[PDB]
Enzyme design. Structure first.
Site, PDB file in Angstrom:
ATOM      1  N   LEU C  38    -144.653 -29.069 -78.738  1.00  0.00           N
ATOM      2  CA  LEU C  38    -143.453 -28.248 -78.683  1.00  0.00           C
ATOM      3  C   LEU C  38    -143.720 -26.905 -79.350  1.00  0.00           C
ATOM      4  O   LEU C  38    -144.805 -26.647 -79.878  1.00  0.00           O
ATOM      5  CB  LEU C  38    -142.251 -28.938 -79.342  1.00  0.00           C
ATOM      6  CG  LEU C  38    -141.354 -29.858 -78.497  1.00  0.00           C
ATOM      7  CD1 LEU C  38    -140.757 -29.110 -77.322  1.00  0.00           C
ATOM      8  CD2 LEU C  38    -142.044 -31.124 -78.021  1.00  0.00           C
ATOM      9  N   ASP C  39    -142.700 -26.055 -79.328  1.00  0.00           N
ATOM     10  CA  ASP C  39    -142.787 -24.688 -79.811  1.00  0.00           C
ATOM     11  C   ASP C  39    -141.850 -24.486 -80.997  1.00  0.00           C
ATOM     12  O   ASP C  39    -140.863 -25.207 -81.169  1.00  0.00           O
ATOM     13  CB  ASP C  39    -142.436 -23.712 -78.686  1.00  0.00           C
ATOM     14  CG  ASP C  39    -142.850 -22.286 -78.990  1.00  0.00           C
ATOM     15  OD1 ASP C  39    -143.417 -22.026 -80.071  1.00  0.00           O
ATOM     16  OD2 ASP C  39    -142.610 -21.415 -78.135  1.00  0.00           O
ATOM     17  N   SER C  40    -142.170 -23.472 -81.812  1.00  0.00           N
ATOM     18  CA  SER C  40    -141.262 -23.049 -82.871  1.00  0.00           C
ATOM     19  C   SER C  40    -139.965 -22.508 -82.292  1.00  0.00           C
ATOM     20  O   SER C  40    -138.909 -22.597 -82.932  1.00  0.00           O
ATOM     21  CB  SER C  40    -141.938 -22.017 -83.773  1.00  0.00           C
ATOM     22  OG  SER C  40    -142.333 -20.863 -83.058  1.00  0.00           O
ATOM     23  N   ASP C  42    -138.706 -24.040 -79.664  1.00  0.00           N
ATOM     24  CA  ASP C  42    -137.989 -25.289 -79.456  1.00  0.00           C
ATOM     25  C   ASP C  42    -137.613 -25.953 -80.766  1.00  0.00           C
ATOM     26  O   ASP C  42    -136.617 -26.686 -80.814  1.00  0.00           O
ATOM     27  CB  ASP C  42    -138.835 -26.219 -78.615  1.00  0.00           C
ATOM     28  CG  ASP C  42    -139.043 -25.680 -77.242  1.00  0.00           C
ATOM     29  OD1 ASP C  42    -138.139 -24.971 -76.775  1.00  0.00           O
ATOM     30  OD2 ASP C  42    -140.110 -25.926 -76.647  1.00  0.00           O
ATOM     31  N   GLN C  43    -138.397 -25.699 -81.818  1.00  0.00           N
ATOM     32  CA  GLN C  43    -138.015 -26.093 -83.168  1.00  0.00           C
ATOM     33  C   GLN C  43    -136.654 -25.524 -83.536  1.00  0.00           C
ATOM     34  O   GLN C  43    -135.738 -26.274 -83.888  1.00  0.00           O
ATOM     35  CB  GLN C  43    -139.071 -25.628 -84.166  1.00  0.00           C
ATOM     36  CG  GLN C  43    -138.743 -25.857 -85.629  1.00  0.00           C
ATOM     37  CD  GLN C  43    -138.780 -27.309 -86.031  1.00  0.00           C
ATOM     38  OE1 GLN C  43    -139.630 -28.064 -85.568  1.00  0.00           O
ATOM     39  NE2 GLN C  43    -137.880 -27.704 -86.917  1.00  0.00           N
TER      40      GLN C  43
END
Ligand SMILES: NC(=O)C1=CN([C@@H]2O[C@H](COP(=O)(O)OP(=O)(O)OC[C@H]3O[C@@H](n4cnc5c(N)ncnc54)[C@H](OP(=O)(O)O)[C@@H]3O)[C@@H](O)[C@H]2O)C=CC1
Ligand code: SF4
Ligand code: SF4
Ligand code: SF4
Lengths: 53, 287, 80, 176, 156, 208, 114
Positions: C38-40, C42-43
């Protein structure tokens, strides 16, 4: 005017009294109502062409 | 062929693109969107009208400076039609009122109009003539509309044989007929399964097929993605719109696939569904 | 009805309710950022999504400090 | 030197203060305004009946963008490109060629009427008075195709008249 | 064929009724607005032609697009165009507005008001002299004299 | 030389020379140039840190009143590393004189937002931000005024070419107005007018 | 070399302000797509938002990141008011082609676009 040794001017720019007079509209119109605001737009002569520069 | 029919550069706004299109119609709905996409492609469109120039005025500035050109045609003489198709790359035939007039039936517009224009066209030497047709227009019953269209289909298939006879299903959009009749209600409810196809995929398909050669001779048919019941679709229309004889017979009549002829997939265009564009178009409800 | 386990179950089904997570694959030491791809972006989506779910605002530095499912659950257990 | 305004006071004398009160309660200078406006009612208004009577002008109006030619002679334009070199919206488009004779001439002399701001610069820049701003100003054109002049349109428009242009220039070839 | 005769006579009456008054709305961006107000002036009339200058958009017959169209201007201009009754006509006045004009090779200028609204009557000029604009509205009236809608409806 | 060539006053030149020498020596923290042209209009060329201090000096002090503010533009000069020139232009009500405060600046580092002492500078600095992208830290409101909203590019630079990149048209497809990459109808021709032959021998620069 | 940056020290504050700006755009989207009577699913609009974010992740110079943050804040202000109309908001989208892909042979047919 800003001129290169040239026949084209490098940069023209225009001080417009329309721009300067539209600039203070809040402090001219803090204490009135809207028809007075239309009178304020009247009492400083506007063309809106020159206010664009 | 001569220059200035060859394409030039990028696309859009009087980039000299390929086709020079004579359109019969285009003051109605589907031809208007078709002129729109050819203006986006940047194609010179010769359209004759017959009505007041106010209607062609409100569809005038679709082109760039002086690209599209306007003249007159009539349903009687070959000379005006021939003068209108003296010089054309392609020609498309889209015409028809969905009620008989005083001076025209469903006969002889669908019959007599493709006769004379195909006559002067095949004597003229046009190429890639695209003739629309309603889907499932048979020799069978219930519509002078559909049977005159079938006679015209046999005409355009027989004389000038390499015409793209094209048929969409019954289209919906900003100026739909049947969804407008769904708005112009009262009521009555029947059963018929039906697939609706949105207008912009249809006209994208028509412009792509007319600009892409080697795809000629074959009749095509355009497919709705959903293909379910009519009355469920009416409930869908009332649900999205917040409120609780020939047209109604000719929507109850016939909706089917024909497995003989090729459709969308020989063209490479994405299908816009009913749901997305229907939510986009159902304005004009209460607040 | 405000315990650690009811909050973890509602956090669990909204982890189910987020779309791009494939699958949920819950752990106390899951670290859905890098161990799940995932991505920051998406974080911070998930952090303010939990904020959208059930309450308190979760500002920026504490939104950075989580990076992990059970650490979210325990940080809510601290804050709520 | 300065001559400013609004420096007075309302006079406390009884006659002047009751006069301001009489104007306040008797609506007086409002009726004075009505009297001035009725004086302009009873004049004759100054209109011109347009499609018959046409409003006056100068000999040096800038209109039609017409061409001239020599006395029983050929086209006055050498195609010396000065008008397109000065044209401040570049609406001139000149492509020049010689012909079979030998005198240098044109091929394509196009004026956009859209970009043409109607300066007068191309008139002043012309060394031979080839292009002349015309006298009449009635274009009123229903289609945008039709507002793009060709050299042949300019020559027809220079041969629908010279007599006006010749009279205007022959009057005022002495100022400019 | 006195049916056709009644068609032609009634079409003359209704179209003369349209072209008779024709009160406009003056949109009026730049100095072309000053010349339009100079054809509102006492010399070049507008009362004579039934032409009532009026800022109302809701009842606008023709619309005199004049001044200089910009990119910031254009969606608001076409929203003004929409809330307008469908029998409507457009006079593009001015070299700026009918083809970009003196600010043609520029950003923030739509190249003429053709690219927003359809145009019946172009009238060029910078400014179009008030006399010439009045001629342009007269030739608008003659376009209205030839419109044959009821002819097309009867033989439709 | 006397008819039809404008004569001048050396007296005003000497006055401005002395005044510029004075200002330069009493605010030495930021002054690099005080230049005086032939026709006596003063220019003071200034590091981009003494903006607030030098303008607070120049608004007051009873030897140089200069309340009146004017133009601010940052004349885009490449072949520099500090590209932009913020030009204040100041007028004295009391002394009838014009001084051009030219401060220099680069692309990305802000000058210090002269609106604190100059209430006229608000839309001036907003205009400079909109046309160029010169940032003004410690400012009340920076927006895009004198551009379209959805448009960007900061167009009065030299990198922004004459036509815009985008061009609107209405279309009936999506029933609204859209933007497209620019399809000019004509070239905007370009006349190589920069003639040779050294029209001013005095302004020659040393070649390499 | 003296360079006086806007806000940044390292990219931690860059990450912090940009993740907060993305949160601002997330709660910005549904209000605007309801307000302008738009016609696009919320999923599609948010994915174009995060796609526009993911375009410029390739820049590490912190002053550039500061100026990006200030630009995005400006347009979030100007769409959280009603100052921008329907046209500019749709203009962020591309629903009118614009068809041109990056195939070699496609650009070899419609010529002279290398
Ligand atoms: N769902 C649908 O509606 C579908 C429609 N089609 C076909 O697509 C075509 C276009 O449909 P649509 O736009 O909805 O209908 P229209 O009536 O609007 O299109 C016909 C066009 O030709 C003109 N026209 C018709 N008859 C005459 C005539 N005798 N003389 C002169 N002009 C004539 C029309 O009016 P005017 O003269 O005023 O210009 C109009 O411009 C039709 O042939 C229809 O059968 C096919 C599949 C589905
Ligand atoms: S300046 Fe005169 S002669 Fe020369 S090219 Fe132009 S119109 Fe022709
Ligand atoms: S009047 Fe001006 S704009 Fe018109 S052609 Fe002459 S020079 Fe060009
Ligand atoms: S054409 Fe001339 S008068 Fe009209 S708006 Fe443009 S600059 Fe002004």
């Amino acid at each position: 005017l800003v001129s290169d040794g040239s026949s084209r001017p490098y940069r023209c720019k225009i001080k417009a009294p329309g721009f300067a007079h539209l600039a203070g509209l809040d402090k001219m119109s803090k204490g009135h109502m809207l028809a007075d605001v239309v009178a304020i737009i009247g009492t400083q002569d506007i063309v809106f062409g020159e206010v664009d520069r | 062929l001569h220059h200035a029919v060859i394409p030039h550069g990028k696309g859009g706004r009087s980039s000299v693109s390929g086709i020079v299109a004579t359109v019969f119609g285009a003051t109605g709905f589907l031809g208007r969107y078709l002129v729109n996409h050819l203006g986006r492609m940047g194609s010179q469109v010769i359209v004759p009208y017959r009505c007041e120039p106010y209607d062609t005025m409100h569809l005038r500035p679709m082109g760039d400076l002086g690209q599209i050109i306007f003249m007159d045609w009539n349903g009687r003489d070959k000379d005006s039609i021939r003068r209108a198709v003296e010089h054309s790359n392609v020609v498309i035939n889209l015409v028809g009122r969905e009620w008989e007039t005083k001076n025209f039936d469903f006969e002889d517009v669908f019959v007599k109009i493709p006769q004379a224009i195909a006559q002067v066209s095949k004597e003229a030497g046009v190429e890639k003539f695209i003739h629309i047709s309603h889907l499932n227009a048979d020799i069978k019953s219930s519509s002078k509309y559909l049977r005159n269209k079938a006679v015209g289909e046999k005409e355009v298939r027989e004389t000038f044989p390499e015409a793209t006879i094209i048929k969409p299903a019954d289209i919906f959009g900003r100026e739909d007929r049947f969804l407008n009749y769904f708005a112009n209600i009262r009521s009555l409810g029947k059963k018929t399964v039906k697939q609706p196809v949105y207008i912009v995929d249809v006209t994208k398909g028509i412009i792509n097929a007319i600009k892409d050669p080697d795809a000629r001779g074959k009749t095509f048919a355009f497919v709705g993605p959903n293909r379910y019941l009519l009355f469920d679709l009416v409930q869908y229309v009332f649900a999205v719109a917040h409120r609780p004889r020939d047209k109604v017979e000719r929507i109850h009549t016939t909706d089917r696939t024909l497995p003989h002829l090729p459709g969308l997939e020989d063209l490479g265009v994405q299908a816009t569904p009913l749901e997305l564009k229907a939510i986009e178009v159902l304005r004009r409800h209460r607040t | 009805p405000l315990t650690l386990e009811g909050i973890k179950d509602r956090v669990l089904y909204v982890l189910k309710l987020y779309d791009k997570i494939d699958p949920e694959k819950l752990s106390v030491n899951s670290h859905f950022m890098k161990d799940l791809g995932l991505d920051s972006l998406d974080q911070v989506e998930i952090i303010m999504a939990m904020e959208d779910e059930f309450g308190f605002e979760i500002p920026d530095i504490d939104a950075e400090k989580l990076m992990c499912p059970q650490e979210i659950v325990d940080y809510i257990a601290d804050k709520k | 030197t300065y001559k400013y305004v609004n420096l007075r006071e309302p006079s406390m004398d009884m006659k002047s203060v009751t006069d301001r009160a009489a104007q306040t309660l008797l609506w007086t200078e409002l009726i004075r305004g009505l009297g001035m406006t009725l004086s302009y009612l009873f004049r004759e208004p100054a209109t011109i009946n347009y499609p018959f009577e046409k409003g006056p002008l100068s000999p040096r109006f800038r209109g039609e963008h017409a061409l001239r030619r020599y006395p029983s002679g050929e086209e006055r334009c050498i195609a010396c490109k000065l008008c397109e070199a000065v044209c401040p919206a570049q609406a001139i488009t000149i492509e020049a060629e010689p012909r079979a004779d030998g005198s240098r001439r044109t091929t394509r002399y196009d004026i956009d009427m859209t970009k043409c701001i109607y300066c007068g610069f191309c008139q002043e820049a012309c060394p031979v008075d080839a292009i002349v701003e015309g006298p009449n100003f009635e274009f009123s054109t229903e289609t945008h195709e039709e507002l793009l002049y060709n050299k042949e349109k300019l020559l027809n428009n220079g041969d629908k008249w010279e007599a006006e242009i010749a009279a205007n220039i022959q009057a005022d070839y002495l100022y400019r | 064929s006195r049916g056709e005769y009644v068609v032609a006579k009634l079409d003359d009456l209704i179209n003369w009724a349209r072209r008779s008054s024709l009160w406009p709305m003056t949109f009026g961006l730049a100095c072309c607005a000053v010349e339009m107000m100079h054809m509102a002036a006492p010399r070049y009339d507008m009362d004579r032609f039934g032409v009532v200058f009026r800022a109302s958009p809701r009842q606008s017959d023709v619309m005199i697009v004049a001044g200089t169209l910009t990119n910031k201007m254009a969606p608001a201009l076409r929203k003004v165009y929409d809330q307008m009754p469908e029998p409507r006509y457009v006079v593009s006045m001015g070299s700026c507005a009918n083809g970009g004009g003196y600010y043609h090779y520029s950003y923030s200028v739509v190249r003429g008001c053709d690219r927003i609204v359809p145009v019946d009557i172009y009238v060029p000029g910078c400014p179009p002299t008030a006399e010439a604009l009045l001629y342009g509205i007269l030739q608008l009236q003659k376009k209205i004299k030839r419109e044959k809608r009821l002819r097309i409806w009867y033989r439709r | 030389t006397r008819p039809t060539v404008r004569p001048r006053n050396d007296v005003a030149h000497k006055q401005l020379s002395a005044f510029g020498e004075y200002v330069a020596e009493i605010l030495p923290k930021y002054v690099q140039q005080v230049q005086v042209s032939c026709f006596s209009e003063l220019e003071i060329c200034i590091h981009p840190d003494g903006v607030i201090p030098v303008l607070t000096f120049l608004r007051d002090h009873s030897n140089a009143q200069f309340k009146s503010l004017a133009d601010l533009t940052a004349v885009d000069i490449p072949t520099r590393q500090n590209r932009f020139e913020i030009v204040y232009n100041l007028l004295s009500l009391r002394f009838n004189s014009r001084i051009r405060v030219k401060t220099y600046t680069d692309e990305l580092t802000p000058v210090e937002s002269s609106v604190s002492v100059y209430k006229a500078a608000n839309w001036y600095e907003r205009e400079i931000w909109d046309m160029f992208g010169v940032f003004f830290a410690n400012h009340p409101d920076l927006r895009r005024i004198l551009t379209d909203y959805g448009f960007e590019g900061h167009p009065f630079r030299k990198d922004f070419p004459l036509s815009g990149y985008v061009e609107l048209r209405y279309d009936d497809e999506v029933k609204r107005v859209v933007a497209e990459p620019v399809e000019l109808a004509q070239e905007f021709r370009k006349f190589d007018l920069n003639s040779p032959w050294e029209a001013f021998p005095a302004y020659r620069q040393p070649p390499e | 070399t003296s360079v006086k940056p806007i806000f940044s020290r390292d990219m931690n504050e860059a990450k912090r302000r940009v993740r907060e700006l993305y949160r601002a755009w997330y709660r910005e989207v549904p209000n605007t797509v309801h307000l302008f009577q738009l016609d696009i699913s919320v999923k599609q609009g948010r994915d174009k938002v995060r796609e526009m974010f993911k375009k410029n992740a390739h820049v590490t110079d912190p002053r550039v990141v500061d100026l990006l943050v200030i630009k995005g804040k400006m347009e979030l202000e100007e769409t959280i008011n009603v100052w921008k109309q329907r046209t500019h908001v749709m203009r962020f989208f591309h629903e009118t082609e614009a068809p041109r892909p990056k195939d070699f042979l496609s650009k070899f047919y419609v010529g002279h676009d290398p």
